[PDB]
Structures are given as C-alpha cells and as structure tokens.
Amino acid sequence: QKLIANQFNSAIGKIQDSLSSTASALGKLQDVVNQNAQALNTLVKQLSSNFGAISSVLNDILSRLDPPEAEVQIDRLITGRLQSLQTYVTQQLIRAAEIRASANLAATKMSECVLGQSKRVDFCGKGYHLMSFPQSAPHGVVFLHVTYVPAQEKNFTTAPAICHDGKAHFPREGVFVSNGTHWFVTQRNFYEPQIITTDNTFVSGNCDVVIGIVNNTVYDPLQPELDS
Amino acid sequence: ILPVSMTKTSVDCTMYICGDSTECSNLLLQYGSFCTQLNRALTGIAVEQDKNTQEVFAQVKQIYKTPPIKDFGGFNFSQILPDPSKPSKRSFIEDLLFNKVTKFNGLTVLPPLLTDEMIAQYTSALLAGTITSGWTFGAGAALQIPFAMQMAYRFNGIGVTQNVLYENQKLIANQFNSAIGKIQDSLSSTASALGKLQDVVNQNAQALNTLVKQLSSNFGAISSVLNDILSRLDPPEAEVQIDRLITGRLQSLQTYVTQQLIRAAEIRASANLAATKMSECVLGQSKRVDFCGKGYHLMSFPQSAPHGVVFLH
Amino acid sequence: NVFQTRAGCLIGAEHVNNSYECDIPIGAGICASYQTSQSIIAYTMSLGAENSVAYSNNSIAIPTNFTISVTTE
Ligand SMILES: *[C@@H]1O[C@H](CO)[C@@H](O[C@@H]2O[C@H](CO)[C@@H](O)[C@H](O)[C@H]2NC(C)=O)[C@H](O)[C@H]1NC(C)=O
Ligand SMILES: *[C@@H]1O[C@H](CO)[C@@H](O[C@@H]2O[C@H](CO)[C@@H](O)[C@H](O)[C@H]2NC(C)=O)[C@H](O)[C@H]1NC(C)=O
Ligand SMILES: *[C@@H]1O[C@H](CO)[C@@H](O[C@@H]2O[C@H](CO)[C@@H](O)[C@H](O)[C@H]2NC(C)=O)[C@H](O)[C@H]1NC(C)=O
Ligand SMILES: *[C@@H]1O[C@H](CO)[C@@H](O[C@@H]2O[C@H](CO)[C@@H](O)[C@H](O)[C@H]2NC(C)=O)[C@H](O)[C@H]1NC(C)=O
Ligand SMILES: *[C@@H]1O[C@H](CO)[C@@H](O)[C@H](O)[C@H]1NC(C)=O
Ligand SMILES: *[C@@H]1O[C@H](CO)[C@@H](O)[C@H](O)[C@H]1NC(C)=O
Ligand SMILES: *[C@@H]1O[C@H](CO)[C@@H](O)[C@H](O)[C@H]1NC(C)=O
C-alpha cells in the first residue's frame, strides 16, 4: 500500500507538468473550439462577398439601382447568402454528430470506467484499469485513468501441469512456474510463488495425455496434520 | 471485414471549376471562401484518414516478430504468419485479399501515409505478439508465455476449465488448423465475402466519376467547355454564362464534399469499431457476447486488406 | 538539393538511410524531421522500435513488480 500510495501520488503530479508546459494535450478540445469560430468567420466573411451582385452591402444596391433591377441583384445575394447558410448549417449538423458520437464515448467511459471497473482492454487506457477520475474542461471532459502496468519480468521454466502419482494436477488460478529447481504455482499478473499443495491445484485426468507435463511432488496440506 | 480508411483525396477548388482560365478565375474570387472552405474540409478528412489507420493498426509499442522456429503445440499459423518470399511480406491469406479488391481534373489521390508493407509489419507484430505473449503486450511489455499454456488462459475466460484444453489439445489443433484452410477456400471463390471493403472502394470511385461527368454538363450554360463561352461571346455575356457553370460546378462540389464528409463519418465510425475490436478482441479476450463473432471468443488474428482490416475470430 | 519520393518531388531536404519514429508524416511512409549544423532530413519511418520476443514452449515470463501510471484521456 505504501509503495502504491507514492506511485499514485507522484503520478498525479506529473500530469500537472504535462499540462503546465505543453499545448499538445488539449488539442482535441482546442481543435473543436477552433472549427466553430473557423466556420463562423467563414460564415461572417460570406456577407461581404459580391456573389456576382453589384455589391455586398445590401442597401448599397438599393441606392444605386431602381428596385426592379435590385430585385434581380438581391437574388444573387440571397441565393448566395442563403446557400452559404445551408453549407454552414450542414457543416454543423455533420460536426454535431462528430461530437454526439464522442459524447456517447464519454457517456460510456463516464459510466463503465469511472462508476465501474472496465475489463475492456485499452478502452480505459493502456494497462489494466484500476479506476478513473473525471475532470471537466471547457466543452469537454478529461478522464484521469489510474491504470496498472506490470514492470519487472523474470524468465521462468513453466509446465502446463504436474504429475504427482500419475494424476495430473493443474493450477486452479495462475501458472505453474519454476526458477529451475522447485516448482511454484503463482498468480499470473504478479509474482508471488507459493508451494504447490492440493488447494492450489485441481486433479484432472491422468498423465499420459498432457503435452508438456513435468514430474514433481504436490504437497499435501493434510498429511502433516495427521501424524500426531 | 471492416472498412478502416477510405481513399485520401484532395481536389483543386479552383481548377476543377475554372479549367486553365483566368476569365473564370476572377468570378470565383467573388464567391470567396467557397474555394478554400472545401480544401479546409476535404483535408480535414484526408488528415484523419491516417488517424483511422493509426489508431486501428498501431496499438503496439514495438514491432515484434515471431521466433525463428514454429512449434506452437500443433497450431499451424504458416497461413497467417508473413510470407518471407513475396517482397512485400503479406501472410498467405492477405495476398488472397489483395487480389480481390482493386490524375485528371485537379482530382488527386493522396498516398496513404502507411504503405502496405508498413501495415503488414504491424499486423505482423500484433499477430506475432498475440501468439507468444498473449494479451500482455497490450498491458505492458510483451511477456512470453507458451502458446499452449496461453489457450488454457483463454478457456478460463469462456468458463471452460483448462483441463479441457491440454487433454483435448491435439484435437483442438486439428480443429483449428482445418478451420483455417476453409477460410482460405471461403475467401478464395467468392467476391461477395469482401463486399463491404469492395463497396467502399466502389462508393468513392462511384462518386469521383459522378463528380467528373459534371464537367461535361451545360447547367443552362450554352456549353460545358469553358473555352467555348469565352471565345464566341463578349465578356459581359460570358460573365453570366460562366456563373451557371461556376454555380453548377460549385454546387456540384458542395454536393460532392458533403457526401465525403458524411461517408467519412461513416468510416470514422467503422474505424472506431475496428480499433475497438483490435483493442478488445485481438489484444485481450472479449467477454462481450457476439462482439467477437458467433460463439464464445478465444482470440483473434488481424489481417490487413486494402483500406480495411480483417479479423479471424 | 533534391530528393525523390514515393509521395512526390521533395526539395530542400536531405535523404537519410537511417530510420526513426515518424515525425512530420508526408506520404508513403516518408516522415520528415528536423533532427540532425542542422537541416531538414527525410527518412523512411520505421514503424515503432524493433523487438523479437524470446519464445520457447516452456518459457514463461511473469512480472514481479508493477507500476501505476495515471494517464489522461
Ligand atoms: C528458487 O526459489 C526457491 C525458493 O525461493 C529456492 O529454494 C530455497 O533457496 C534458498 C537459497 O539459498 C535455500 O537456502 C533454501 O533452502 C531453498 N528452499 C528449500 C526448501 O530447499 C531455490 O533455491 C531457488 N532456486 C534458484 C536456482 O535460485
Ligand atoms: C516423470 O517421472 C516418471 C516416473 O515417476 C517417468 O516415468 C518413467 O519413464 C521411463 C521412460 O522410459 C520408464 O522407463 C519408466 O517405467 C517410467 N516410470 C513409471 C513408474 O512408469 C517419466 O518419464 C517422467 N517424465 C518426464 C517428462 O521426465
Ligand atoms: C502448416 O501448413 C502449411 C500449409 O498448409 C504446410 O505446408 C505444406 O507442408 C506439406 C508437408 O507435408 C507440403 O506437402 C505442402 O506442399 C506445404 N504447402 C505449402 C504451401 O508450402 C506446413 O507443413 C504445415 N506445418 C505444420 C507444422 O503444420
Ligand atoms: C517495485 O518497483 C518499484 C519501482 O516503481 C520499486 O520502487 C523503489 O524501490 C526502492 C527499493 O530499493 C526504493 O528505495 C525506492 O524509493 C522505490 N521508488 C519509488 C519511486 O517508490 C520497488 O522497490 C519495487 N519493489 C520490489 C519488491 O521489487
Ligand atoms: C529471458 O531470456 C531471453 C532470451 O535470452 C532474454 O532476451 C530476456 O532478457 C530474459 N529475461 C530477462 C528478464 O532478462
Ligand atoms: C519444447 O520444445 C523443445 C524444442 O523446441 C523440444 O525439445 C521439447 O520436446 C518441447 N517440449 C514440449 C513439451 O513442447
Ligand atoms: C544510403 O546508402 C546508399 C548506398 O547503399 C548511398 O548511395 C546513399 O547515399 C545513402 N544515403 C544517404 C542519405 O547518404
């Protein structure tokens, strides 16, 4: 717990440094917020375009021209501007589903990841996922995924089962391993080698069929308890 | 078989409209940003078309490769582990796929950022890290585990005690091996297997032709060759006739782009679904019923296919 | 100075036979980068690093220790 406390406490710290000096993290949010003001400018500038009409100031036609020609010109403005809206409206509808699709991805992570513990691999972030902490950000959300990444490997000789008397003992949960002499049944995602006793291992079949099985003695819990 | 990326394509918002002609170039300047909002759009696709391919295929830190000598316990992956012979190294299956699925008006086709021999290094890595290391290369450094002791940890995931495996190992290999061959005959004789991928590649090429033919249409303008209206008429007349061309040849682009945006956001969805299978199904083992295919799910093997990915569940 | 790509005609940057992570991706796996005195190089990207796992039918590798990495999404 101690070592885990520090590894987490530190881990939060480094975030603030990734966030302090760097603008690359928030690109997603930032890229969205631009694409709007992007379009709006585009949408605004489209006012000052001629669109083929004599001028883009709607009343500087009307001074120049007697209405029946303006009525012809103001079309090319309307027809121009109107179309320019739909092109903007569409681009919102399309983009609004590019968010709407991301909402559901958050609305999921907010449920499964935060409120639960998500078995889905590399959904809740690379590694095994412990929990997650949401944080709001403008027009967006930021999850801090606390993930569990294993570290220090050690090679080991393994065997898929063990012959005791000709019965085959298989590990209930975890692998058989050995460091080269003694046989240890350990859990898979962390190394805690334990003597092999019949409560680690369930009997199944017998020894001729298995491919790879090795000899050993699987210790009896009970047999010592006997002799007195 | 999932579409992943579509064909990255830009377009010249000017030449497409006004071929080789300044007379028409002016009257485009009137409409302003309708030229450059397009290239702003069509690029914002071709930008992410390599984000799609990125998220899907590169979930793996390092490019692994198989050990030299294959003994996996009787499973035969020689079908799917990359062919050393073909210079592009694409495991025997993927070369099937690449047989199935198959520069003018400003229309370009941009090169996909990742060439196949790259994509086929990843889907070699993934496929070759899944074998030895199991899922542990998605959670960290790849941890070699005997493939025959792997499957026993993919039976504990479907609720079958592992002693089923080791005793039935042989039979399972033959059931696995034999099951691979069919996939090669399945794919071999039928072009309606890949139709999805085949349809994407069609829909684009379907849309491009549609876009190109528009250059031959009158739109009420007396000709579809811009040079004509220029030559026979005096400018103040061509000022109008070229509008309808421009208007048409513009309103034909917005139609075209708005398609691509939609269609891309369809691919953008299918990519995320693939990158979800690649993450959940390939790397780990999936508990999500019928997400990884009919039946309980043991593992999955990705295989690239042109503008797509193909899983063997 | 002139190079020739699979993507197109590249001008102003120097070829490099080495291969590093992708940096300013261009096309057909040619990723330009400014690392080098300096100049702009262009070099075929090597996807990822390279590794080959040591696999043998009795060889298993169990992590003895872990980290905790708070990511950000
Ligand atoms: C493998 O690990 C086991 C247990 O950690 C080791 O067994 C003990 O090793 C110590 C090392 O000096 C001995 O003092 C003990 O007597 C051993 N236990 C028994 C019950 O004999 C084993 O030595 C390790 N093997 C290697 C090669 O390191
Ligand atoms: C595990 O140990 C058993 C003995 O407990 C070995 O079985 C012997 O194998 C030899 C090989 O020819 C036979 O001649 C003996 O008759 C076997 N013993 C019995 C009691 O039948 C077995 O070979 C060992 N397995 C491994 C992998 O070393
Ligand atoms: C794995 O499968 C491949 C192809 O199915 C096998 O390659 C064949 O091997 C036989 C040997 O009896 C040859 O007659 C064939 O000509 C080979 N085919 C090709 C395309 O090379 C390979 O032997 C199998 N290996 C294992 C271990 O199952
Ligand atoms: C597990 O790995 C961690 C590294 O994340 C080790 O942490 C260091 O352990 C040393 C022990 O010599 C301490 O002096 C350091 O203060 C620890 N560093 C941090 C950042 O906490 C840890 O010791 C390892 N545990 C085992 C059992 O190997
Ligand atoms: C296990 O053996 C392989 C093969 O020599 C080696 O590459 C690997 O580094 C070894 N494991 C460790 C933890 O060093
Ligand atoms: C493991 O492989 C080695 C060589 O690859 C071989 O000698 C041995 O018989 C194999 N044993 C098992 C159980 O796979
Ligand atoms: C790469 O090596 C070749 C020789 O095989 C050489 O001609 C070429 O100049 C080298 N590239 C660079 C950038 O020097």
From Swiss-Prot, chain A:
<feature type="region of interest" description="Heptad repeat 1">
    <location>
        <begin position="1"/>
        <end position="51"/>
    </location>
</feature>
<feature type="glycosylation site" description="N-linked (GlcNAc...) (complex) asparagine; by host">
    <location>
        <position position="215"/>
    </location>
</feature>
<feature type="glycosylation site" description="N-linked (GlcNAc...) (hybrid) asparagine; by host">
    <location>
        <position position="155"/>
    </location>
</feature>
<protein>
    <recommendedName>
        <fullName>Spike protein S2'</fullName>
    </recommendedName>
</protein>
<feature type="glycosylation site" description="N-linked (GlcNAc...) (complex) asparagine; by host">
    <location>
        <position position="179"/>
    </location>
</feature>
<feature type="disulfide bond">
    <location>
        <begin position="163"/>
        <end position="207"/>
    </location>
</feature>
<feature type="disulfide bond">
    <location>
        <begin position="113"/>
        <end position="124"/>
    </location>
</feature>
<comment type="function">
    <text>Subunit of the fusion protein that is processed upon entry into the host cell. Mediates fusion of the virion and cellular membranes by functioning as a class I viral fusion protein. Contains a viral fusion peptide that is unmasked after S2 cleavage. This cleavage can occur at the cell membrane by host TMPRSS2 or during endocytosis by host CSTL. In either case, this triggers an extensive and irreversible conformational change that leads to fusion of the viral envelope with the cellular cytoplasmic membrane, releasing viral genomic RNA into the host cell cytoplasm.</text>
</comment>
<feature type="coiled-coil region">
    <location>
        <begin position="30"/>
        <end position="74"/>
    </location>
</feature>
